[PDB]
């Protein structure tokens, strides 16, 4: 009974209340009020139909009489005279602190609990004869013609179905009858309203559960698909379309660990026969439902086959038998459906056709899945993934690692296939590995399922694939596009073909394919290559004598197409295939296809001809090798066959982008055991782990060669010019290597590129005093790459050798490529800050500072100082700091020299340019110390007697005082006071440009 | 039907039941959530489980008690599901693909569920840890990266064994991490892991069972982390805040750093945290906005939530005898403030007000740690505030609104420290008078201060009649001296004052409450005529009703004769369309506390409403608008509604005079926009008799329910704040007398309406002053049904 | 304009794929124009507007898909260019020259980015004795293009497909009148096509000689050719 209890006054369900005069008094009065509202409704709809204001006030009087029973829900939440519980909670509650509340809050908190104990009381009930009378009225109002009335009534009839039981039933058995009427009473705006009702959240939802009535309703919404005159028919389509997306039914034995109901199993003996009884009724309640849909299925195919032509809402049917003759949890594959779904190709309409395919391909992948599951419909949702043709493999097997490698290179006697994305391996072996069997079977199905597939291949004529692909091409001219939905349909025709049902012979799809290859029509070529991808997904289909007719057609076709004469339209398509196909099928299901792109009759070597042609391969071989990344990659050839010397860019760049990919394929570390593995990670120098992806020696050898082959040729440009440069072999190599580095520093290959920086990649790149103008020509930005390598996935031990490469004692070697290594440092620091041992944090700072002084280049003394500040910003400890300040301000302090001299020195002396550049950076490294450190005034003062001298240092000392006076701008109202020193005056000159006097 | 009961159960957790039955219930919902084959409302079932296993159901932890009570759940079922999300060969069958919402959204749920049932995986199946990793690992490859990592973080149990511990698997995470550059698609999982695991080790080390088979996991310098492991995560977090902005919900990203602190071997860590604050320093500055200003803010907050988080969990354990030197010391709380103070002060002035409310909310968290530093914060905040009230920021908008938010998110704590508290009377009577009528925003941010000061302070004269008293002479002089001191660089620790003088200042400070409410009420009536709207109209009524409850009878009985006074004699309801709410409701809240005030207030609203009707009010017809010649009649009618609603049993005295006036209000006065008002009188009087509600909300009861008069910070921190003699709430309970008048009315108005309407069924279709009258009676009837709603029984028709 | 993109243009170019739906088919001896009418109320006066099919001169006409008040501002100035090229050269204005004249005002805003681009996309159907019958198109991009058959507005991408299918170069005029209606089978959000949701036009080889009649259909004449199949 009662568990809510809210001080109901008349006693909490004791029927201490029924023996209370005061309680029959009260309800006898709500009855009068109810019978009086009906008295008024009939009196209005009769005397005042054309009034909205009256009917609104009545419809609220009913939203109340029906709801405000136990509780008060309209008016529920108006700001009243109680403090709000939600407000007060924000003011007083700290988090991670239990109820730190003042007395005031505890009190609302409690009142708030009472008030919620009242609303808990479920007001849901059985309709009270009179209550049914008023709900019928509230419908004739939500069925009225005035929007100012039907819109509040609908909102008012929803607050009333929340409150009555199976009231949805009362509503429908009033709607449908008085919608069937409003149709044979013509174009009514009462139809427009009834449709508005059917779109109410609470109704449109209970609709997908009314199996009895949705029979009759869909046929009414159909009759309605005629704008005999209004917004109707637009609404009837949205609604019939909303419907196809709901509904269904679940036979499948809840794959439940029976432990989901046991723990709560009562002692009660077999007083749980009841359970096995419910199991049986909620099982024929179901089976009746399931039959009502099949009755509706067949009763529509009637109105589609027999109705000479209804127009283009020919579509609801198809959009639906489909989410049905392929649902499972039952659904008896009807053959009369597969017939009708296909004979709708005769309307030659783009949208219908796109769907007949989408449907025929699902309506099969369902029948197919009955054979693979052996009618054990349950077996789908059991992660003991049945399929008779799936096979698990033990990977711990002392020996396995070299079955894989030497079995992925096997194309003729293939033992297993992994269609899709091959996960297991790569990191380590040991797991079990789901895999697929060769020359996959077809399997058997019962006769009902058999005659259904027959009724497709007997309908897939030479003529029907002609009509259907044609169309898919023309609707396709607008867009381009590929959709797998297309390919996964051709594999289906193939299953049907040589499994018995079609008999079209494969030599029919070879014409259908060669047919749609007009070197001109793009959407027509896209159909041809959609066809090819199907013939390679059609090895999940028997015949080793057809898998040879197909391997043979394919080496012949890729010849015509890719072996010279290739537009940026074909390349656009085929290159699309390469990135896709190897991911939807293991490519070893074909001897010819792959062993064709890797047949590399394409990479010339020098230029006194036309060299030749193109990446008439490279970028497509690459996009296949990218999509396998693991599998098939035996490429003894390619590495021995790469170029580098090539004259053209489009190729030099592509040979680089390929090698990048060739390297990511031999860098997977796939180890023997998880245990063997974690013991390698544990014993690493960095408390961290193993370099993930590590380039294997035999390759670390290749690369090292290409760099030291380029060092061999430094004689090749012994003295040539920019024009006789782009033509040398030294350039060609160098350009290729560069394009390669650019593509390593991008993406998942970074951890591969690091070991090479210190000895190879940074000595290179700074191939830039190897000519600045040669870079502008064959547009290469080295500066931007060298420095963009300051940020990146460096490891504890690699930092060491890199800081040692910069800060080189051989430094003095380079020249204004000096302001380059100095900018690489400024970036490293920002990405290895907090990770640099105070040792390294110093090797850097002693280099930077050794540059504020380097005779010759004034350019760099300044770039050094701008950088010395990046350091002194994270340097708050006050004795490293205050010991610099001193080191610098010793070269200047006081009037060490009298006026005439400062002028002379300021223009030439480098040891003093440095001292002022340096001391300048320190001050510019504390931009906003909110209350100002007294070492700054006293040290701008030492800097002001110097920014009063015109020369080279006295200039970069004016920089330092203007830079400063500027950033201090808004905090200046105040900073003024820490300048007792009338050396406030001393800071007024400072900034001078040509426009000031 | 399943889904229904699964709910009535949810409803049952509100009372209690045996842990031996939770063992049962949880087991049902663990395995139930993992069904397959039908339409399932999973979100519900994973939520039952999550609520049944709650780790803080009112300080009680049900995962501990369920571990102890023999709960054990199958991991193969969970992992077997989460693995359907891997590349199943033969594309024709792969059912789940990430990327496409409907799928990723299930995965995110399973993963959540597993996290929930991680602690019930057999601690005893020693080869459950190692078996499960040796499997996930072999499954890891670029194409699985996305699905594997998350799994590990939520399906593998934190075990720790003699040979194979879970931290055994760290060197492998810092193999992936540290190999790709900052990538939220990856990092987020690494932090979630080494962090919820570092949290674990810490939790387990304290109080409970310092083991789980191995206390063979040593803490030290940097939590469970190597020297280089810690070093790495620091420069990665710096990478995030300065360069690559790659983090989401930061609560999770901060864990590892908090739970690597060791109270007795900090130092080396704080050295690493300081250099991370000195790096980050410039990027917080108010005029360096960028892609980073979000990450730095959402972090500096996530970190100080997740630190105070820990502290208040340890201080809950040193209320169980167990210090542990791993614990956070008074000196950690110190160096935390040293670090993030300029950082927090810069952020709070930021140009984005949301990005500021993050740095500003950190003051509250720091002050709860009651560090020795506390003064440094109170020092800034109070200068910033006193400057602002002295218009020294008038050129800069943000400083004014900022330093009022600083001060609000910190009021409650100032009411404590026996020095600052002095200022609080002044600072309040200053906020009240500075309430602007043109600046909607400044006013919303002032009410914030005013209501916070009232929520944690009793408006009471605390003078024992001590003669020296007066606000000047005794409070002001001191307040200025403290301020002078604080301003000139000196801090409050250097500030010496006699415990005698400083308690004169405090007591004398509680005198101004009277002269200041005369100025708040004045500012209310000025606000009746402003286009402030909604959010802020309400918040203002909270401030007026909170100010009332924190008032002793001496002061309140004044405030009352001051609303009463000003409500009648006012020149303040002109402008078009007024906010009556701001004045009618604060009356109702007087009658809540003192029913005695009703007998006469109501009889005055009626001989003033009859007055306005009799002189032509609501004579002129109009839908859509309230005629301005009516505005007065409408004030008195809203007051009558709002004030009956809170009359209760005191309404029994003038029962007959009301009913006969209500019938008068409906005989006369017809006008569709006034009838939506007049018809509410009937409701506000039926609801008030039989609605069962609170009545007392006072900060401190009766005027006398002495905890003494060291009773400021509203007991918000005292443990007596909730012993039953303090919380002696009043409550209105409907008596047999009230219900009986309640019903007299119901039938007397119910008849009145049905007659007057059954009369008008001699139909004038024209009139239109007819459809006005029928609507009237149907509204009076309607509001007669509501409020009067508590006397009805849903079930009556069964019986 | 970030990547080489005309933003404020795509804005209005796709605001077009919302309003209206128009079609043009060039036969060998005539031209055809057609449009669907905006969301109609019972009480809207059907016959008056001619709201989306406007005459420019006795030998040229446009179909509109866009904001009405916006195209009228354009058409008003194009009916004038026509007459200025008369008063000036005493020959009827050549179709391409009129089209360019507008396309140039459209692109005028596509660049003097201080005023807002044009709604509206045009199909022009015209005859001039230099280039037989002509069919043109005018997005607010500024571009115009030659067409044997074309469409603008909602459900554009769809009709372009049926058109591509049933069109033949030898087509007569009546054959093309059908192809236009027939393929507003599909591209119609209103289930079933009425004479009142329509507006039609023809430029034929005259009702008599070797010359050029122009004909904006009156409602009745539509319900008459609709009779040929559509509705009956």
UniProtKB/Swiss-Prot annotation, chain A:
One of its GO terms (molecular function) is lysine-acetylated histone binding. HEAT repeats lie at residues 170-209, 633-668, 756-795, 839-877. A motif (YYX motif) lies at residues 995-997. It is found in: Nucleus; Cytoplasm. GO terms for cellular component: cytosol; nucleus; proteasome storage granule. Keywords: Cytoplasm, DNA damage, DNA repair, Nucleus, Phosphoprotein, Repeat. GO terms for biological process: DNA damage response; DNA repair; proteasomal ubiquitin-independent protein catabolic process; proteasome assembly; proteasome core complex import into nucleus; proteasome storage granule assembly; regulation of proteasomal protein catabolic process. Coiled coil: none annotated. Its main location: nucleus. The keyword NADP does not apply. The keyword Nucleus applies. Belongs to the BLM10 family. This is Proteasome activator BLM10. It comes from Saccharomyces cerevisiae (strain ATCC 204508 / S288c). The gene is BLM10.
From Swiss-Prot, chain C:
There is a cross-link at residues 87, 186, 218 (Glycyl lysine isopeptide (Lys-Gly) (interchain with G-Cter in ubiquitin)). Keywords: Cytoplasm, Isopeptide bond, Nucleus, Proteasome, Ubl conjugation. One of its GO terms (cellular component) is proteasome complex. Its main location: cytoplasm. InterPro entries: Ntn_hydrolases_N (IPR029055), Proteasome_alpha (IPR050115), Proteasome_alpha-type (IPR023332), Proteasome_asu_N (IPR000426), Proteasome_bsu_CS (IPR016050), Proteasome_sua/b (IPR001353). GO terms for biological process: proteasomal ubiquitin-independent protein catabolic process; proteasome core complex assembly; proteasome-mediated ubiquitin-dependent protein catabolic process. It is found in: Cytoplasm; Nucleus. Present with 17100 molecules/cell in log phase SD medium. Belongs to the peptidase T1A family. The 26S proteasome consists of a 20S proteasome core and two 19S regulatory subunits. The 20S proteasome core is composed of 28 subunits that are arranged in four stacked rings, resulting in a barrel-shaped structure. The two end rings are each formed by seven alpha subunits, and the two central rings are each formed by seven beta subunits. The catalytic chamber with the active sites is on the inside of the barrel. The proteasome degrades poly-ubiquitinated proteins in the cytoplasm and in the nucleus. It is essential for the regulated turnover of proteins and for the removal of misfolded proteins. The proteasome is a multicatalytic proteinase complex that is characterized by its ability to cleave peptides with Arg, Phe, Tyr, Leu, and Glu adjacent to the leaving group at neutral or slightly basic pH. It has an ATP-dependent proteolytic activity. This is Proteasome subunit alpha type-3.
């Amino acid at each position: 009974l009662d568990i809510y209890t809210c001080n109901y006054y008349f006693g909490n369900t004791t029927e201490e209340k029924l023996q209370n005069p005061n309680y029959l008094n009260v309800h006898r009065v709500r009855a009068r009020i109810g019978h009086f509202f009906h008295k008024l409704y009939v009196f209005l709809s009769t005397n005042f139909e054309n009034n909205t204001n009256m009917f609104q006030i009545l419809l609220h009087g009913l939203k109340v009489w029906f709801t405000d029973l136990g509780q008060e829900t309209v008016f529920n939440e108006d700001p009243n005279a109680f403090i709000d519980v939600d407000f007060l909670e924000n003011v007083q509650s700290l988090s991670h602190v239990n109820e730190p509340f003042t007395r005031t809050n505890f009190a609302i908190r409690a009142n708030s609990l009472h008030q919620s104990r009242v609303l808990l009381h479920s007001t849901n009930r059985k309709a009270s004869k009179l209550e049914n009378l008023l709900l019928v009225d509230i419908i004739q109002l939500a069925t009225s013609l005035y929007p100012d009335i039907y819109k509040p009534a609908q909102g008012t009839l929803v607050h009333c179905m929340k409150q009555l039981v199976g009231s949805y039933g009362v509503v429908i058995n009033k709607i449908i009858p008085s919608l069937e009427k409003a149709i044979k009473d013509h174009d009514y705006m009462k139809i427009q309203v009834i449709l508005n009702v059917l779109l109410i959240k609470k109704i449109h939802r209970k609709l997908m559960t009314d199996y009895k009535d949705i029979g009759r309703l869909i046929f009414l919404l159909i009759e309605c698909c005629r704008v005999n005159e209004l917004e109707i028919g637009m609404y009837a389509d949205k609604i019939l379309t909303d419907i196809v997306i709901g509904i269904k039914i679940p036979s499948s034995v809840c794959v439940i660990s029976d432990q989901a109901f046991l723990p709560l199993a009562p002692p009660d003996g077999t007083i749980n026969l009841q359970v096995e009884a419910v199991k049986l009724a909620k099982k024929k309640k179901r089976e009746y439902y399931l039959s009502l849909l099949v009755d509706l299925q067949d009763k529509l195919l009637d109105k589609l086959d027999n109705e000479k032509d209804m127009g283009w809402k020919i579509r609801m049917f198809i959009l639906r038998f489909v989410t049905q003759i392929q649902s499972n949890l039952e659904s008896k594959p009807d053959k009369r459906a597969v017939f009708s779904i296909i004979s709708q190709i005769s309307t030659k309409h783009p949208e219908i056709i796109h769907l007949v395919v989408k449907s025929l391909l699902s309506t099969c992948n369902k029948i197919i899945s009955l054979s693979d599951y052996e009618y054990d419909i349950t077996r789908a949702y059991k992660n003991e993934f049945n399929p008779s043709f799936v096979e698990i493999l033990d990977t711990s097997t002392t020996s396995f690692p070299k079955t894989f490698t030497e079995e992925m290179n096997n194309f003729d006697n293939p033992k297993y296939f992994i269609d899709l994305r091959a996960y297991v391996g790569w990191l380590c072996w040991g797991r079990l590995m789901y895999v697929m069997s060769p020359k996959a079977l077809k399997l058997n199905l019962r006769e009902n399922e058999l005659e259904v597939l027959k009724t497709a291949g007997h309908l897939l004529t030479r003529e029907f694939l002609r009509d259907v692909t044609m169309n898919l091409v023309q609707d396709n001219e607008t867009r381009g596009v590929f959709s797998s939905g297309n390919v996964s349909f051709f594999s289906l025709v193939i299953l049907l073909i040589s499994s018995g049902f079609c008999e079209l012979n494969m030599s029919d799809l070879f014409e259908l394919c060669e047919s749609y290859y007009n070197k001109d029509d793009k959407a027509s070529m896209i159909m041809s290559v959609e066809i090819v991808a199907g013939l390679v997904c059609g090895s999940k289909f028997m015949s080793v004598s057809d898998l040879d007719k197909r391997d043979t057609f394919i080496e012949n076709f890729l010849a015509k197409c890719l072996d010279y004469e290739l537009n940026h339209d074909a390349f656009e398509i085929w290159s699309t295939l390469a990135w896709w196909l190897p991911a939807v099928v293991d490519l070893r299901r074909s001897k010819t296809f792959f062993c064709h792109f890797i047949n590399a009759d394409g990479m010339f070597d020098r230029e006194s001809d036309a060299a030749t042609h193109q990446t008439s391969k490279i970028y497509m071989l690459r996009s296949i090798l990218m999509s396998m990344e693991f599998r098939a990659p035996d490429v003894g050839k390619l590495f021995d066959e790469l170029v580098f010397d090539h004259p053209y860019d489009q190729v030099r760049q592509a040979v680089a982008k390929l090698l990048t990919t060739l390297v990511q394929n031999q860098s997977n570390p796939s180890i023997s055991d998880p245990t063997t593995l974690l013991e390698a990670e544990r014993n690493d120098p960095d408390g961290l782990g193993l370099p993930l992806k590590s380039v294997p020696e035999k390759v670390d050898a290749y690369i090292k060669k290409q760099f030291e082959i380029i060092k061999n040729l430094e004689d090749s440009v012994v003295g040539l010019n920019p024009q006789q440069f782009i033509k040398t072999d030294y350039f060609y190599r160098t350009s290729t290597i560069f394009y390669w580095i650019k593509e390593m520093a991008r993406g998942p290959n970074k951890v591969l590129l690091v070991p090479y920086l210190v000895d190879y990649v940074l000595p290179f790149l700074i191939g830039l005093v190897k000519h600045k103008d040669v870079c502008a020509l064959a547009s290469l930005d080295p500066v931007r790459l060298y420095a963009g390598l300051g940020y990146m996935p460096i490891r504890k031990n690699h930092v060491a050798a890199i800081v040692d490469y910069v800060c080189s004692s051989n430094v003095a070697l380079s020249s204004n490529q000096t302001k380059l290594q100095l900018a690489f440092i400024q970036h490293f620091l920002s990405a290895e800050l907090l990770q640099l041992t105070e040792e390294e944090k110093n090797k850097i700072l002693e280099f930077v500072v050794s540059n504020l002084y380097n005779e010759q280049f004034v350019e760099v003394r300044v770039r050094a100082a701008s950088i010395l500040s990046d350091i002194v910003h994270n340097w708050k400890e006050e004795q490293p700091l205050l010991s610099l300040i001193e080191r610098f301000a010793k070269g200047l302090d006081v009037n060490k020299y009298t006026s005439k001299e400062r002028q002379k020195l300021s223009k030439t002396d480098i040891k003093i340019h440095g001292n002022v550049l340096g001391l300048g950076a320190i001050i510019s490294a504390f931009p906003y110390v909110f209350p100002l450190p007294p070492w700054i005034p006293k040290n701008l003062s030492n800097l002001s007697s110097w920014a009063r001298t015109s020369g080279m240092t006295g200039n970069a000392a004016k920089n330092t005082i203007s830079e400063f006076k500027k950033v201090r701008a808004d905090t200046w109202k105040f900073d003024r006071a820490s300048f007792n020193t009338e050396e406030l005056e001393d800071l007024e000159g400072v900034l001078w440009r040509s426009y000031y006097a | 039907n399943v889904n229904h009961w699964t709910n009535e159960l949810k409803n049952c957790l509100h009372f209690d039941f045996p842990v031996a039955l939770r063992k049962s219930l949880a087991t049902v919902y663990y395995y139930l959530s993992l069904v397959q084959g039908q339409k399932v409302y999973r979100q519900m079932h994973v939520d039952m489980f999550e609520r049944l296993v709650s780790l803080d159901d009112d300080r009680t932890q049900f995962t501990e008690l369920l571990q102890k009570q023999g709960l054990l759940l199958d991991h193969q079922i969970m992992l077997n599901f989460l693995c359907e999300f891997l590349p199943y060969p033969d594309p024709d069958y792969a059912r789940y693909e990430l990327s496409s919402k409907e799928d990723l959204q299930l995965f995110r749920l399973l993963l959540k569920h597993a996290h929930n049932a991680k602690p019930f995986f057999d601690k005893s199946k020693e080869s459950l840890l190692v078996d499960t990793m040796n499997f996930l690992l072999s499954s890891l490859a670029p194409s699985t990266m996305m699905a594997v990592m998350p799994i590990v973080t939520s399906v593998v149990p934190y075990h720790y064994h003699i040979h194979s511990k879970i931290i055994d698997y760290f060197p492998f995470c810092y193999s992936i991490w540290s190999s790709v550059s900052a990538n939220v698609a990856i990092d987020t999982h690494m932090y979630d892991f080494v962090g919820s695991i570092s949290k674990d080790v810490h939790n387990k080390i304290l109080s409970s069972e310092h083991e789980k088979d191995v206390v063979g996991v040593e803490f030290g310098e940097f939590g469970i982390f190597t020297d280089d492991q810690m070093t790495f995560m620091f420069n990665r977090l710096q990478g995030h805040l300065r360069t690559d902005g790659q983090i989401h919900s930061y609560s999770r990203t901060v864990k590892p750093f908090v739970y690597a602190i060791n109270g007795s071997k900090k130092d080396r860590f704080f050295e690493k945290l300081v250099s991370l604050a000195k790096a980050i320093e410039t990027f917080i500055h108010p005029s360096n906005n960028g892609f980073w200003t979000k990450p730095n803010a959402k972090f500096v907050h996530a970190f100080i939530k997740s630190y105070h988080g820990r502290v208040k969990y340890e201080e809950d354990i040193c209320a169980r005898g167990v210090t542990n030197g791993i614990c956070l010391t008074s000196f950690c709380h110190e160096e935390i403030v040293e670090i993030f103070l300029n950082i927090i002060s810069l952020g709070s002035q930021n140009k984005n007000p949301d990005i500021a409310n993050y740095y500003i909310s950190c003051f509250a968290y720091l002050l709860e740690l009651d560090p020795s530093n506390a003064y440094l914060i109170y020092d800034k905040i109070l200068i910033d505030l006193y400057d602002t009230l002295a218009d020294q920021f008038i050129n800069s908008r943000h400083r004014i609104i900022s330093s009022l938010k600083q001060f609000t998110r910190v009021i409650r704590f100032i009411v404590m420290d026996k020095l600052y508290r002095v200022h609080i009377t002044n600072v309040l009577s200053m906020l009240v008078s500075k309430l602007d009528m043109n600046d909607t925003n400044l006013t919303s941010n002032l009410i914030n201060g005013i209501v916070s000061i009232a929520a944690f302070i009793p408006i009471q004269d605390l003078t024992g009649e001590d003669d020296y008293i007066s606000f000047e002479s005794d409070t002001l002089p001191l307040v200025q001296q403290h301020f002078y001191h604080i301003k000139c660089g000196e801090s409050s620790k250097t500030f010496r004052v006699d415990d005698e003088l400083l308690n004169n200042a405090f007591k004398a400070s509680t005198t101004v409450f009277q002269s200041m409410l005369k100025v708040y009420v004045e500012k209310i009536f000025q606000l009746v005529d402003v286009d402030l709207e909604d959010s802020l109209v309400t918040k203002i009524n909270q401030t007026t009703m909170i100010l009332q409850e924190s008032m002793d009878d001496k002061i309140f009985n004044y405030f009352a004769s001051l609303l009463n006074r000003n409500f009648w004699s006012n020149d303040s309801f002109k402008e078009k369309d007024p906010n009556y709410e701001l004045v009618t409701i604060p009356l109702a809240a007087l009658v809540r506390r003192n029913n005695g005030l009703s007998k006469e207030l109501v009889r005055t609203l009626l001989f003033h409403i009859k007055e306005q009707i009799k002189r032509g009010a609501g004579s002129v017809r109009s839908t859509s608008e309230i005629q301005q010649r009516d505005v007065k009649l409408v004030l008195y009618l809203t007051a009558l509604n709002d004030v009956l609603r809170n009359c209760h049993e005191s309404l029994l005295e003038y029962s007959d005079e009301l009913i006969t006036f209500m019938k008068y209000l409906y005989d006369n006065v017809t006008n569709p926009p006034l009838d939506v008002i007049t018809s509410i009188v009937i409701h506000s009087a039926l609801a008030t008799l039989c609605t069962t509600e609170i009545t007392d909300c006072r900060l401190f009861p009766e005027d006398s329910k002495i905890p003494e008069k060291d009773r400021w910070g509203g007991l918000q921190f005292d443990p007596r704040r909730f012993d039953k003699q303090h919380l002696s709430f009043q409550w209105h309970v409907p008596s047999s007398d009230e219900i009986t008048l309640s019903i007299s009315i119901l039938e007397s108005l119910s008849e009145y309406c049905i007659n007057n309407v059954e009369e008008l069924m001699k139909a004038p279709r024209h009139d239109s002053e007819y459809g006005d009258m029928i609507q009237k009676y149907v509204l009076v009837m309607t509001h007669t049904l509501s409020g009067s709603s508590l006397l009805f029984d849903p079930d009556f028709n069964k019986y | 304009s970030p990547e080489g993109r005309l933003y404020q243009v795509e804005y209005a170019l796709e605001s077009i794929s919302h309003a209206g739906t128009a079609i043009g088919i060039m036969a060998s001896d005539g031209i055809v124009l057609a449009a669907e009418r905006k969301v109609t109320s019972t009480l809207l006066e059907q016959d008056t507007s001619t709201e989306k099919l406007y005459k420019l001169n006795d030998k040229i006409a446009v179909a509109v898909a866009g904001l009405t008040a916006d195209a009228e501002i354009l058409i008003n100035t194009a009916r004038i260019h026509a007459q200025n090229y008369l008063k000036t050269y005493n020959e009827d204005i050549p179709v391409e020259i009129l089209v360019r004249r507008l396309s140039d005002i459209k692109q005028g805003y596509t660049q003097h980015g201080g005023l807002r681009p044009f709604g509206v996309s045009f199909i022009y159907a015209g005859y001039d004795d230099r280039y037989g019958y002509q069919l043109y198109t005018s997005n607010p991009s500024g571009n115009y293009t030659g067409w044997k058959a074309i469409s603008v507005g909602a459900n554009t991408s769809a009709a372009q497909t049926l058109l591509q299918m049933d069109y033949k170069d030898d087509m007569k005029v009546d054959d093309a009148i059908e192809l236009a209606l027939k393929t507003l089978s599909k591209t119609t959000d209103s289930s079933a096509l009425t004479y009142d949701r329509l507006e039609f036009a023809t430029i034929r080889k005259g009702a008599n000689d070797g010359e050029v009649y122009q004909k904006i259909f009156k409602p009745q004449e539509i319900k008459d050719i609709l009779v040929k199949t559509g509705i009956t």
